[PDB]
Design a protein around this ligand. Structure first.
Ligand SMILES: C[C@H]1O[C@H](O[C@H]2[C@H](O)[C@@H](O)[C@H](O)O[C@@H]2CO)[C@H](O)[C@@H](O)[C@@H]1N[C@H]1C=C(CO)[C@@H](O[C@H]2O[C@H](CO)[C@@H](O)[C@H](O)[C@H]2O)[C@H](O)[C@H]1O
Ligand SMILES: [Ca+2]
Ligand SMILES: [Ca+2]
Length: 686
């Protein structure tokens, strides 16, 4: 199948995602609406159900509203059954319209529809070449007070109708009971409760296996992607085993949100984005795009520097999901805001690297403050707004032009208010020019591009005051004036003759998993795939064609490998790095060490003899370990993903700056479980 086929569940950079709060989009079946205090058909109380469902999305795919726009992926609210309570917080009533207060991850939320309606949604979407991404929030169940069991449904968790337990009188320890987080430390935000949400305990084998069987079920129903909620609030080691479960079973694109405050970007934000096996929502992209296109708190050098920083500080910049607003921020379009600012921000995101997500209602110029104001029902299904037409013209180029789906980003011209960047992949080119200044025309001189000679017509059709670009010999464009607010897109596509890899998915799996390598110039004759120096040929390559290769991972040692393709004539591609071959299936083990006293700046880490523990390299050791909430200093603890069913050797070590202090004595050994979790409790060997 080609790389752009709806069948490619692993990579999404040729797609445009439309993010739908299911309840606020379209009520196609009123019979399923919540009644009573839980419902507000006028949708003026934005904390209640307004009635929107999966038949509403099916109807908007069928009648062409979403396909007319060129949307190839929808991201919907979490599909699982939620609590039915109307909770009153300080006079204001609240319901699970949002889908985040789960109670059974194996059933659907009936307000959205039945299992047959979810299947009709998947088959309709797929028959119209639309991929379906779902939210999945394995961090917690719902609001609960252990002191007051009558509040809400007391965090209760069910398994396909069978009650597993509640927050009050949790004798099985399905949940954490450390109090509520004050967000002071990452550790404090993982093991304590977020607000009043019953925090699930993933170190309990029953919660662990349940959440993994639950996501496999949704993979079997045909979903094509998962957005994992609250990744900043769950142990990294448990998330790595959760990702391994998906990838070793039916790998689909998975991403989450590490939230960063205004310009406060974290290393661990990037660390996790590189280590976990999942992609992140690009907060830095959205922040800078609002600072430059919306609030004018920074200028085009700020935007250039963020686009320059991302290509090198993300391992997979093509898997980062970009956006300009979403459910957690004020809407980009404000009341006194010029609509052209939104239309430029949209054209920028749709032609920029990554996987673009469009928040529902953007194209209908919705405005609103933060939650719940940014989640109003969308007011209209007009197919003639300028923003609808911008998406309609640009979104197809993700499928048709490999430079927008996969290419590099190079600023070809810039000043305080203007940027012209080129996107490049092999022979394919796209150039985009944006003038954010709404009163001054910008005089463009000396623009050089990679386009061949020709008179390129603006793909946007002049809608955002764009112009034709006249390109001469050597990519030099003749000068032009970019209109106030002007935006133009020019492109050229041809076949590549050489292999170029644009994306690989999944990026972490064990031997024998089929990975998808997407790009151009692979050719129709089966060739060779390299994991490091290891050649994979013939029947281990499941499918080979010019834009897509599907190949089984060879039985190589666990660790990080570079991938490379050679077509049937021996021409080799660029190197796709940072691919993690896992030693096998994973389980998360908690490691606890007592009597490890440290100095100022000295922390405890773990390493051992498998790639998952860093293969005895102190710089690739796991940690720093934790020591405040589940256990207190001098006892340190940490949840680590390790290969299932085998004996690993390992040792702990303290590290302050460059000095590694190893504990003495002999190496420790431990035989990991086949599934579920385990705890290892040891004492510092001097
Ligand atoms: C819990 C969230 O924490 C971090 O993001 C916050 C961030 O701290 C704020 O500064 C920013 O202004 O808003 C973000 C959303 O609160 C973290 O990195 C996020 O990834 C995480 N996001 C999730 C988590 C929850 C799960 O409940 C959602 O909240 C919902 O639950 C509350 C309480 O039940 C409801 O009343 C809300 O209406 C729901 O949105 C967040 O929206 C989601 O983004
Ligand atoms: Ca309904
Ligand atoms: Ca947690």
């Amino acid at each position: 199948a080609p790389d752009t086929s709806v069948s490619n569940k692993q990579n999404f950079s040729t797609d445009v995602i439309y993010q739908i709060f299911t309840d606020r989009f379209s009520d196609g079946n009123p019979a399923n609406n919540p009644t009573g205090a839980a419902f507000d058909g006028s949708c003026t109380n934005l904390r209640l159900y307004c009635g929107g469902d999966w038949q509403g999305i099916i109807n908007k795919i069928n009648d062409g509203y979403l396909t007319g726009m060129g949307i190839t992926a929808i991201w919907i609210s979490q599909p699982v059954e939620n609590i039915y309570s109307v909770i009153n917080y300080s006079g204001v009533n609240n319901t699970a319209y949002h889908g985040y207060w789960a109670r059974d991850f194996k059933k659907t939320n009936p307000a959205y529809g039945t299992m047959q309606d979810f299947k009709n949604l998947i088959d309709t979407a797929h028959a119209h070449n639309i991929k379906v991404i779902i939210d999945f929030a394995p961090n917690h169940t719902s609001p609960a007070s252990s002191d007051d069991p009558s509040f809400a449904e007391n965090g209760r968790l069910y398994d396909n109708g069978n009650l597993l337990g509640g927050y009050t009188n949790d004798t099985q320890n399905l949940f954490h009971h450390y109090g509520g987080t004050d967000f002071s430390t990452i550790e404090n935000g993982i093991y304590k409760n977020l607000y009043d949400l019953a925090d699930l305990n993933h170190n309990n084998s029953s919660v662990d296996v349940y959440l993994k069987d639950a996501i496999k079920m949704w993979l079997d129903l045909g979903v094509d992607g998962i957005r994992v909620d609250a990744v900043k609030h769950m142990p990294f080691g448990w998330q790595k085993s959760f990702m391994a479960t998906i990838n070793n079973y039916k790998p689909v694109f998975t991403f989450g949100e590490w939230f960063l405050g205004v310009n406060e970007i974290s290393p661990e934000y990037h660390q996790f984005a590189n280590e976990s096996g999942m992609s992140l929502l690009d907060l830095r992209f959205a922040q800078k795009a609002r600072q430059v296109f919306r609030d004018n708190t920074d200028n085009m050098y700020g935007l250039k520097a963020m686009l320059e920083g991302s290509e090198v500080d993300y391992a997979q910049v093509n898997d980062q999901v970009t956006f300009i607003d979403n459910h957690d921020m004020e809407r980009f379009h404000t009341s006194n805001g010029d609509r052209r600012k939104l239309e430029q921000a949209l054209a920028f995101t749709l032609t920029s690297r990554g996987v673009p997500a469009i928040y529902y209602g953007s194209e209908q110029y919705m405005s609103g403050g933060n939650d719940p104001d940014n989640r109003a029902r969308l007011p209209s299904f007009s197919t003639t707004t300028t923003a609808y037409q911008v998406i309609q013209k640009l979104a197809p180029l993700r499928k048709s032009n490999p430079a927008i789906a996969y290419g590099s980003t190079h600023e070809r011209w810039i000043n305080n208010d203007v940027i012209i960047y080129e996107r490049k992949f092999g022979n394919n080119v796209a150039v985009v020019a944006i003038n954010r200044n709404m009163n001054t025309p910008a005089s463009i001189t000396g623009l050089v591009t990679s386009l061949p000679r020709g008179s390129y017509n603006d793909v946007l059709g002049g809608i955002l005051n764009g112009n034709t670009l006249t390109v001469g010999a050597g990519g030099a464009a003749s000068n032009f004036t970019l209109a106030p607010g002007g935006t133009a897109v020019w492109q050229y596509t041809t076949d590549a003759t050489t292999p170029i890899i644009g994306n690989v998915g999944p990026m972490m799996a064990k031997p024998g998993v089929t990975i998808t390598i997407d790009g151009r110039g692979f050719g129709s004759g089966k060739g060779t795939v390299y994991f490091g120096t290891t050649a994979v040929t013939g029947a281990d390559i499941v499918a080979w064609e010019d834009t897509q290769i599907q190949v089984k991972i060879p039985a190589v040692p666990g660790g990080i490998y570079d991938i490379r393709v050679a077509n049937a004539a021996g021409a080799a591609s660029n190197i796709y790095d940072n691919f993690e071959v896992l030693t096998g299936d994973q389980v998360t083990v908690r490691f606890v060490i007592n009597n490890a006293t440290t100095a100022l700046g000295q922390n405890v880490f773990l390493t051992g003899n498998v790639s998952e523990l860093g293969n005895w390299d102190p710089n690739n050791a796991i940690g720093p370990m934790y020591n405040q909430v589940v256990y207190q200093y001098p006892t340190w603890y940490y949840d680590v993903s390790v290969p299932a069913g085998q004996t690993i050797e390992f040792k702990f070590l303290k590290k302050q700056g460059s000095t590694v202090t190893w504990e003495g004595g002999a190496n420790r050994t431990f035989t990991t479980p086949t599934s579920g979790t385990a705890t290892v409790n040891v004492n510092w060997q001097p």
